[PDB]
Design a protein around this ligand. Structure first.
Ligand code: NA
Length: 181
């Protein structure tokens, strides 16, 4: 419909920890915006099944966070593997953005990209090599005019779709508050 090579692919992952070689993806969500950050479509929100032995690698922060959000129960119930999650996400993205054109967009998105390289390389390959990291702008704002940051707050629920929605809202806030373009 509004298929364009200027559209942006936003992605957030939840994981069993911080180390791609050790840990696993347990949730993925994607959103497509246009170049002006208008949300065009939300993609599959997928709790990815992992066996107990992988969930058992989670530290206290991960265990309490992902249990209290209901994600662990959804992971245990899920019948969707990483490959099926890739397939579903690619089938969605191909309707909105061409392959290789959108940077990866989100908060500290380098960490997510590391997990994509290791666990979902077919999905990583869909992104342009660049990064649109909203936390880059957060950090520069904290240093150049930190009082701006008191005007925006995040819930930070670690539900992947809600957090990527917050990432977009954060960048929308920055465009009005710290940008002049
Ligand atoms: Na994240």
């Amino acid at each position: 419909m509004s298929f364009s090579d200027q559209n942006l692919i936003w992605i957030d992952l939840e994981m069993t920890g911080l180390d791609p070689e050790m840990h696993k993806i347990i949730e993925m969500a994607t959103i497509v915006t246009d170049s002006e950050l208008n949300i065009l479509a939300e993609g599959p929100v997928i709790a990815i099944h992992q066996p107990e032995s992988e969930l058992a690698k989670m530290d206290e922060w991960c265990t309490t966070t992902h249990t209290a959000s209901g994600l662990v129960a959804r992971v245990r119930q899920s019948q969707v593997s990483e490959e099926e999650a890739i397939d579903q996400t690619l089938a969605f993205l191909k309707q909105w953005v061409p392959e290789g054109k959108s940077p990866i967009c989100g908060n500290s998105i380098g960490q997510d990209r590391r997990f994509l390289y290791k666990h979902m390389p077919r999905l990583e390959a869909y992104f342009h090599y660049r990064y649109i990291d909203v936390s880059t702008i957060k950090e520069l704002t904290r240093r150049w005019q930190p009082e701006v940051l008191k005007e925006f707050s995040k819930t930070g629920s670690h539900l992947a779709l809600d957090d990527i929605r917050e990432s977009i809202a954060e960048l929308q806030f920055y465009r009005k508050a710290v940008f002049k373009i």
